[PDB]
Design a protein around this ligand. Sequence first.
Ligand SMILES: [Mg+2]
Ligand SMILES: [Mg+2]
Ligand SMILES: [Mg+2]
Ligand SMILES: [Mg+2]
Ligand SMILES: [Mg+2]
Ligand SMILES: [Mg+2]
Lengths: 330, 333, 331, 330, 338, 332
Amino acid sequence: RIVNVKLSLKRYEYEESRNVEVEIVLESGVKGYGEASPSFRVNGERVEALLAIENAVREMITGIDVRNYARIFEITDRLFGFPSLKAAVQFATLDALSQELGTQVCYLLGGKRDEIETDKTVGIDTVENRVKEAKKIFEEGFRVIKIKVGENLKEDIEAVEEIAKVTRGAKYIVDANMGYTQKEAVEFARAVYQKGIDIAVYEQPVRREDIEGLKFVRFHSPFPVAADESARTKFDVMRLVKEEAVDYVNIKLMKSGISDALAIVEIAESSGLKLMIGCMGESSLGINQSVHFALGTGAFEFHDLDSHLMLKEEVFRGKFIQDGPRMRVK
Amino acid sequence: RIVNVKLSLKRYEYEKPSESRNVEVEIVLESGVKGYGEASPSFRVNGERVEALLAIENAVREMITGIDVRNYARIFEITDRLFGFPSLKAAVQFATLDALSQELGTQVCYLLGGKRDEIETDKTVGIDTVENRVKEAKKIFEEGFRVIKIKVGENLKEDIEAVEEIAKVTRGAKYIVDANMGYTQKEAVEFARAVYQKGIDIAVYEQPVRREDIEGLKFVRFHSPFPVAADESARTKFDVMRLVKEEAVDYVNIKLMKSGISDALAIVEIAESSGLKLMIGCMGESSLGINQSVHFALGTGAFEFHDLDSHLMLKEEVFRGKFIQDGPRMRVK
Amino acid sequence: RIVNVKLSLKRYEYEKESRNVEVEIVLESGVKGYGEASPSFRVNGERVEALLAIENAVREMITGIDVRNYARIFEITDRLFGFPSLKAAVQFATLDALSQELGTQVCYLLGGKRDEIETDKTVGIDTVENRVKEAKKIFEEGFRVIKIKVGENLKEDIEAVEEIAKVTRGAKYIVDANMGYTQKEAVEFARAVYQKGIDIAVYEQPVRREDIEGLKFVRFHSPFPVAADESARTKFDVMRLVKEEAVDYVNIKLMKSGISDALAIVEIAESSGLKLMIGCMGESSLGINQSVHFALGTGAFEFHDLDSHLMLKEEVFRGKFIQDGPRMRVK
Amino acid sequence: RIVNVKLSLKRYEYEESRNVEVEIVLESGVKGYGEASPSFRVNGERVEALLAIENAVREMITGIDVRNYARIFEITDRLFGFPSLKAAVQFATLDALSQELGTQVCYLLGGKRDEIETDKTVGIDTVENRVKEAKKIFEEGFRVIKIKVGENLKEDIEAVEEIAKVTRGAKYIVDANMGYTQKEAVEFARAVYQKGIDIAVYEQPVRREDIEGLKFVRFHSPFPVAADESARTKFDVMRLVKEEAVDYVNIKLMKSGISDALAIVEIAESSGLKLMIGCMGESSLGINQSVHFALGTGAFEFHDLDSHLMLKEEVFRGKFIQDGPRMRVK
Amino acid sequence: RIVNVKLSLKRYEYEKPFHITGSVSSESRNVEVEIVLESGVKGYGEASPSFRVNGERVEALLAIENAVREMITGIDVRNYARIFEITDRLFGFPSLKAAVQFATLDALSQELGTQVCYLLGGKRDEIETDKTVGIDTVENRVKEAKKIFEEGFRVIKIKVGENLKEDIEAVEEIAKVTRGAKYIVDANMGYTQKEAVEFARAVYQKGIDIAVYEQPVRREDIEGLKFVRFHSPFPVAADESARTKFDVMRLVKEEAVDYVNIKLMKSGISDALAIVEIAESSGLKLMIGCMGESSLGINQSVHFALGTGAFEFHDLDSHLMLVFRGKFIQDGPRMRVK
Amino acid sequence: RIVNVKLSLKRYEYEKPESRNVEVEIVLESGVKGYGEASPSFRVNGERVEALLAIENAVREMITGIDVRNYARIFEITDRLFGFPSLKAAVQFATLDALSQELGTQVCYLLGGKRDEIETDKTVGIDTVENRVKEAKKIFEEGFRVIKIKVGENLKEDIEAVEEIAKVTRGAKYIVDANMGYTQKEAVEFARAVYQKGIDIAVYEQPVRREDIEGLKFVRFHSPFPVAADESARTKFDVMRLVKEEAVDYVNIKLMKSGISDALAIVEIAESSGLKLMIGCMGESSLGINQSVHFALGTGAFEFHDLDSHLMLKEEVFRGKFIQDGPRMRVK
Ligand SMILES: [Mg+2]
Ligand SMILES: [Mg+2]
Ligand SMILES: [Mg+2]
Ligand SMILES: [Mg+2]
Ligand SMILES: [Mg+2]
Ligand SMILES: [Mg+2]
């Protein structure tokens, strides 16, 4: 049984990310840990707001045995306004449970895979700095490169071409972050396509509420279209599946929590949907949540878990092994 | 890691017509821990024959031997290939969790969520004479069961009469009606309407039309005042996704013998993500077989109703389930 | 009336082993009808040992029934939906026996629509060099319809098709991706091959069997007719594909549908603008005989992919038909 | 092989039905017989027109071996404007074929059933006269009674109630022959239903082109709804299925011929559709066509094959046994 | 009031055998209809039946004279709507239905001292018809198109459907020797959906424009018509799939086509009028065709097209493929009211 | 050929709770004069009688010089007056009125001459249930066997009004027009209530708002009586939409909404889709109702006729080219 719950502000400098770490302590002395990396843009969350409800969170789950984690999951699903916190508390519960069970979270989730590979992101910058970053990334061993676009169609097309030139042999994931209209999103795909470049996953090119737009882009795009911001809850995904809107759903524990993340996996594998997993601004201890999730369920074609690689940490705090673009368990 | 897998034929005698031939699954790990599952095949629903299950023992052994149970998801994926032998898929998958839970120092229900500590099953009133049907009902009600499953589907007029008569002698109980695909769309609706006008309430109206008639399920759902469930029409997670997309039913009756543990877990998530209600049923499982569903139901806590009485219909000298049976209720120790 | 039904394992060796179950139906008149079940674990979930194990149940199901009431035998055997290949074997053996008592052949009993059919031959997955070699040999043997298996590597598959096309000018092509492509990959494949100026007569099951919307998506974008194979096992599957307007073609396999559902699928197809092709699993000459009579009798197929017996080693031919190069006729 | 084929006007006095009998003669001496009972209202046919194309029919199939009957079927499908003749020639072909095979048509078609039961029809007349036909029919042993309605909703309802009272124990098939509007059709069913009367099959209450009307009635009717005039060809039936318009299809060889009838049976059994088989004005030789079709396929829940019972023939010319309301093979 | 109706068989020989997908004809056996009124006025119509399209046979049309006579004798033509309603029962003899309904308007307009086209609205004074290029070797098709072009025809209908490869070729070659002309391509149900789309794409790629792509797939394949409509850069028309006003309402509901080719021989005057109203109420374009009408028969469609003025294109050349007996002015490819 | 077209205001006094119409006279060079009447509707068509009169010159310039034998040309041109449907109707009919004269016949015959007689209903306006039953009884006494009942402002009293009217008019059929006054739920309750009282309604007209097509369809599904579109069916395009959406059982055609042009189209659309039809009116005087009488007689397309506006007005001299015999209309 949980005896106490603690939330703590943890700041990480890039190369700042304000997260909230969750610590759950059991009667047995075991301690579980999770990390909430909130998003105002995606979830409408504010870190100060997450910190203000520490007592309510404590009260919601204190006294519940982690062996009845499904009860903790149902209760924390009520924190739909604080999804990143939902994620952290649910994972910390499993982290604690897997310790009392003498195993790891990934195995608790099925231990499907022993290794996964993450991409690294080439953010928005001048075409020059972009390509320069792509080369650096490619050099470090990354063979899946995430390219951010969305605010300048013509320049975005040019950037992808230039990046492809200096990274032949790698696959590309393009995230337009809701910056394009339907017609622009289609034009982006076609232009890239005519240059002989292939995009493994074309992420959320239109507005989050524009489900028909996603469907429209999916139909004309020669590349697989993914929903990210349009896919926060299991209910959003069921709607996406019913409207036959996308080829992929990009799961983020920060949007869905563990509970919804698990449902989305089942729904996807039951409807021909492909999956990729992403992140927000998690540090090593937070990315750990996604690593175990991706390793145990083994449900993802691609993994975009590089946020911890953009932060400075005195010491590694994840319960996994980071080896180049690869992650494994021990 | 799994070092051995054994399939064994096991017969159980009923009380009223006759026999249930299940295939028991034993998995042995290098640690010495042993996990057990039971396949209760169905020719009518799954197209399976017990002799057929027994014959592919070496194949099953070959499929999972050498795999560590902590990587149960690998075993689950490999066994999903046994879609032609779903009852065996279930037995192997649960046997795997039975073994894994022991090595983790817990029970399967907790591994699945530990949502609930107790569930209640119904008791079945098979098709017979109105008098005999009412006799069964009274006995069942007398035994403490407050949820009674009534089988119908062969004679609309009599089925309507039977339900009414059963209701009279079991006031205070809830009813689940399973037509087992025996009615046409119009008959199914008439059955619902007739019972309704008699002031009787049906908690779950199970598969009144043929399994391939999804449009029929939806038709009956629309006109029926009672919740309509898919049973034979819902064997895999894919069947259920289709039912959801077609808005065909209010309920899905999950049976591990149809879906295996893998698809069952998938169905639970799909249901809770689409406004679908769930009940869990069974085939001809013995106490050790019903154990599989008891832990699944307790752990997930996903079902409104439980139709797990197959073991109470059979004869067994010694109880072999890893759970407590207290009257209509079931819990874990 | 049927006096006995026997199931027996039959092993056949490949040129470069197919284990089937032969079915013999014995009539009180002395007449014997034969069928063959070539099970598929991947498509039907069947295992050869499981089929052999239900011999008694199968014999019990139809012994004593007069073959002139074959519709009763068909209905009863439809219950073997978990053993479709056996369903097919028993049903065809019933027709083989019946036609002998009627003084005719199965193909005529089924309409006798055509007197000759042509089958393709397959170029399996292998290095491009070996693929081109198989093709050249097959082409030289006179085959003018060539089936190309793909699905594991999009880039290489497009390449393989082009190379095969280069050395088989004059042949028509059927590509079977066996559920290996995603919807986008399936569309890209067709577009790439099209841009090469290559024509594909039938593009078979590019996506997973449960992905009906995928089939339809590919159907919409593909410049070549798209077929359902794994997605079309029963007549109910076909009705669903028709209602969904998912495909241009249905590849019928007796091992998936049995004779009963196959007859239904033919009528559903000709009643809905759907075209057909007939395929096989690993049937020996006696087994493929079942499909040859069905194709000749109904005359329902644009294409025939019945080359399984040509890949096996057989002491003596056991088909009740004439094999003349890529062509099959009735004698 | 067919050496000759001839059409012959055959008139039958009621208790007049003008049919066209088809005789096919094979080189082996075997002769096959069929009968076309045309319908101007349903098929647009005129008996004089059928007779005038005799030469065209002979030239279409002469020389073809009946063992290649599927070729004859495809050629005769071109006679879609003379469906009754299509049925006759196609059956005559099977009749001759079965003889050369030493068996019967019903066995050629599957031999599923050894006996079938037909209803008897209560025609349009005063309410009092309808009740008299009903009693007379019930007395004769018929337990399935087809009641024709459609000209007066008000009296049609009364007629049905009155007929029910004097025929307790019988099942009823009501054929509105397209006489009701969608709303009148629904009211009819509701009214009858409130009187505790059950209708096993409610046949074509609205106009033939009104597929949506049939679907509307189907939805509100507590009784199964059947398409008759709306289902002539296998293509009409595929459309009815795609639209989910009816519960039943009433097949008539005079509308579909043998080829389409076989197709409709398959389509129906593959879509949850129930079937019944009816007739036009066939004599015993023509009803014989449907009897063998119904016995062989065994596809029908109900049989409305009583036209030959409404006519007078000194010599029974069917190749079956009529035993009260039952028909069997010998 | 109609006092008598008489049918008669008249045969017309084509200049050369006419070949279309799965069909060749070198003769046209039509049934002429003569209606005589109590006033002495005589109205004329012509039925050019079609076995392939309507399932009709000329011998069968002749055999029902008494039935037609029985249906309308005694009715005043000024009550033409009653005659129209009654004759709609001849749905199995649509060409005869057409002939009788037109003969009725022909007689009525005489008693009113006007012409049929005016009774129908008198919308246009002139219409232009195309000329057809039947199926043959590529050389002959070009030669035929060449001849047609020099005769003044600027709308050329090309038959295709038996060989995709050669059809694409024939169309390209014809376009080279007929620059300035518009083209109508009729596949008469010869192609599969994929083949029909490919045909249009190949022609389009060659820079050739097709004003009307007529019935590429089978008549019952409505979804196919829609599939082709979606991918085809050219307007797609229903011909064989559009016989009755009900067929067209279905085509509209399913958004299957851009055009409907109306032929009086398929719909008669009644359904044809209904089809015009349905089309103009749903964004559907129309063209009017024919079967094997002689000049007296084609006169029926000329008056219909002139009066309603509802058609973008006119394929009224059957009488040209065969003394003038029409009631209009034939001027090269132009038809005018007298 | 038309040599002039003139519009003139005509006022007609009602008997009980004035109708201001615009009469159209078309003059041909032959001396023949064709007449039509535009009875505008602000509520339905958004028209205002003063606006109709103001565009006389535009109307004249649009068709002057055209021969009426080319009437389809005149119909096409006048379709541009979609903002003045009533005038469109009057000009189109007046054209046919002049044409039939030159051809020595009548408009009904030019439109097919399908029927020689039609029967109209008479309307019971909204008032106290007491005056309601009063009007109905009187109407019934005059021989009318089809009675149109106005409702829509008060569900409870409307249901009451109908039951009371039904009791004092046994043998008559009823048409109920809610004139868009009910919500979907209220519209369905009205039909059910009346149905439960064993009363039958032949045509249940436009229960909900004009743009609520989904509403019409919802009422259609639950109503045991045929539902008709009136305000939602003004143009042929409106009807095609109703047909495509499967929204109603009936369409109530009014020449004042559609003109002759769209009216002929709606008839063909209806007969090609299983849609039944009824024909209504606005406030036409005898000369105006003449237009719909010929249309109804000629086309013979209507199950019911609601042409009583001229019976509600006061005219010393009948001005229709037809015969008004009690509730029946025939031509001579
Ligand atoms: Mg994103
Ligand atoms: Mg059940
Ligand atoms: Mg395949
Ligand atoms: Mg009937
Ligand atoms: Mg054409
Ligand atoms: Mg109104």
